[PDB]
Amino acid sequence: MNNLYRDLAPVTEAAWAEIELEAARTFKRHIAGRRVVDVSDPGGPVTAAVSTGRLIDVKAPTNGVIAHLRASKPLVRLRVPFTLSRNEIDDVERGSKDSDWEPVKEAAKKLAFVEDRTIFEGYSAASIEGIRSASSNPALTLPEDPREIPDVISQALSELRLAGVDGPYSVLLSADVYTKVSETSDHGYPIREHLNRLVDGDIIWAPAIDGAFVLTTRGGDFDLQLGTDVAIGYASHDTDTVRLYLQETLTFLCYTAEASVALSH
Amino acid sequence: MNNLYRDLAPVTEAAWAEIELEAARTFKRHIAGRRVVDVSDPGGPVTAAVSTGRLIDVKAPTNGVIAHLRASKPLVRLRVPFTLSRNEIDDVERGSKDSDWEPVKEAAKKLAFVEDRTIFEGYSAASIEGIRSASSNPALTLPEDPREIPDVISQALSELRLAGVDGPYSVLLSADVYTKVSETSDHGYPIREHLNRLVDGDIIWAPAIDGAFVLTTRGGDFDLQLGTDVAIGYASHDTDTVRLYLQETLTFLCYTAEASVALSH
Amino acid sequence: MNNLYRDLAPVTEAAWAEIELEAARTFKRHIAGRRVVDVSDPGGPVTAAVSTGRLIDVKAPTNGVIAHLRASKPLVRLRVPFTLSRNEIDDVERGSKDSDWEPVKEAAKKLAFVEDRTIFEGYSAASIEGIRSASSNPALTLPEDPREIPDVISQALSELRLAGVDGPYSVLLSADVYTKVSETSDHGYPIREHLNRLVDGDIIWAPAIDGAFVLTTRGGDFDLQLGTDVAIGYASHDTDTVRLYLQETLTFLCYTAEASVALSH
């Protein structure tokens, strides 16, 4: 067995298939970051750091010796525990199709939110700079009126053009901004369609982020490194409940500072 | 023979083909529910209940015995009788093509209305909860002005997005609402086209329901179980008329509470 | 894995084989009901109800609609927990052949007693009518003197003959009555042999029932429906003991009211 200790969990095979399906579905729906960044293959469990290729000056060991430390970025392992009713698990073999997988959905939504907020806003404790912090283009303010959203977005499209950047540009919106441009309409279309006319990429719902992000998806600018992708593991169990977790280990690198514009309220 | 007792009816083969065609045509046109829900294969005449896979605590038979009843949902058989003129039946072999099949059309419309109102509004006596009652998303009020319909519908599309749900969304409208958004026009299109721009599913005419329903058609959320599909059976006859019926047996299950938004006036 | 969670139990393979053998042996010995009734194949875990083929009038959904609920009988799941010493389990691999399987035997005897008392005396909470309650033939009183038992039994054989019934008749006795007709002797034979001369079926020891039952085993009159047959499942464990259970899910149907005579004290 492995670190998931999956065979020790009192979960049947059919219940496991339903839990895997629910977690994978809810996660994909709430991920916006993997649609725009380069996603590496999983390095594996032993992978601990990503080389940046830079060098750090250290106090010379002896006379005439020049020493340099190799720089690297550590992976962070992110774990979201959740708790399942054993009655709901037992219902699945009897043929129930409405078993309560709400904790699985909440854990997948929380893991997806962490991953997206780590990619776009950073996680300083894990030495990850967000796309918002690593952007060299000027930051823009989103207006209160949703009918004035496409104007400011177009100004962001000016900045990537002034930065000398090609590629399909894509706009990612926070859930508040996505709702505002979805529910306001002008001439038989919502403002989301007006945003769709400005770019050759995609208007992407990004419920974890704040503000908005416009960026190129030409490739090679944004890199998500995975040691291991999302997995479900077993912690402990009692007569009534099974404690499990969702787990993934990653770091994020931004190679190109001028490939994005961040917007705030 | 079977329970339809079809060979006992004084109906010719050509008249039978015309009656089957008229009933099938009028039924499909008035069904909205089967276009969005999962429809099972017919179980057969012996099928009486659908297992839910849940358990019900019952008073222990003896000491040290733990007993549980298996929960299930009963099928309901729905029968709509109708009456045909025997002169109209006799006209068909002579080559008439305008035989009065209005009772067949009224029976098919009434059966379709029952089935759709059972799926969407429930039938408590048959222990069927409607989609409106089983929805966990908040209910919305449809405005008086049809030009304000697409706005509220978009708010419903917000709620399924806040519920974490994917899939093609589809909007079903009552006949009053469908007429209102069909006959009011803005900038060379009716409001029905404005609704069509908001979703990747279909604006569906649903004359049996009240209000409106927005829901995902990704699959596995809404399940119509059929023991036997719509069939035409023979009851009795006299010199002038033949009494027949339309008959179908079914139950409806909603597995996913957050996959729909109901709207009312 | 399944709902038994059998691989999670700290029970060795040899100990499992001994427990299965002990439970199966003790159960068969104490079952009288399966020797006389028709026993279906196991439906499976998803099976929840048995269709009776009857219809129940419900309040018409709308005008001109005739609705009927399909009638059915729910299965009941019967679980008898029991507790095993882990020292006795560990003794089996070392080669012990006297490991204490008394709790297994008591659980099998209790499960067999429940099943037989459910078949013959009913379980109202599970909507099961017993053979005694569903019999239309008159009930008889068993006399105090065992030498007068064969007389009354013969009167029961009159009643099935007056009911117009063929087939091998079989007599099932309670443990008190079986002991009384076993230990009293007349002319070199016990009274049990005198009972054996009256029928072409079998004198059957039925320790769970009260009184006596005489009935035909021609087939098609008494039907035991099994979703799942007797299985051993794992609940929980500590350093000293393993909690397991015996479990079976069933219902019982009596199709023929006049195929049996019940006797009481």
Residue numbers in the entry:
A (entry chain G), B (entry chain FB), C (entry chain A): 1 to 265
What do the authors of the reporting publication say about this deposited model?
Encapsulins are a class of BMCs characterised by their conserved subunit (Enc), which self-assembles to encapsulate enzymatically active cargoes and can remain porous to cargo substrates. In vitro cryo-electron microscopy (EM) single-particle analysis of the Mycobacterium tuberculosis encapsulin was used to obtain three structures of the encapsulin shell in intermediate states, as well as a 2.3 Å structure of the fully assembled shell.
We used 89,072 particles which were found to be in the fully assembled state, yielding a 2.3 Å structure of the complete M. tuberculosis encapsulin shell. The encapsulin shell forms a T = 1 icosahedron and has an inner diameter of 19 nm and outer diameter of 23 nm, measured along a fivefold symmetry axis. The icosahedral assembly of 60 copies of Enctb can be described to consist of 12 pentamers, 20 trimers, or 30 dimers. The dimers are formed by the interaction of E-loops from Enctb subunits of two neighbouring faces, forming a tight interaction. The M. tuberculosis encapsulin shell has multiple different pores; single pores are present in the centres of each pentamer (9 Å diameter) and trimer (6 Å diameter) and two pores are present at the interface between two Enctb subunits within the pentamer (9 Å and 5 Å diameter). We did not find a clear pore at the points of twofold symmetry. The diameter of the central fivefold pore is relatively large compared to the reported pore size of other species, such as 6.8 Å in M. smegmatis, and 8 Å in M. hassiacum. Overall, the encapsulin shell structure of M. tuberculosis is similar to T = 1 from other species, with some species-specific variations, such as the relatively large fivefold pore diameter and the rotation of the distal section of the E-loop. A notable difference compared to M. hassiacum is the absence of a disulphide bridge between Cys134 and Cys254 in the M. tuberculosis encapsulin.
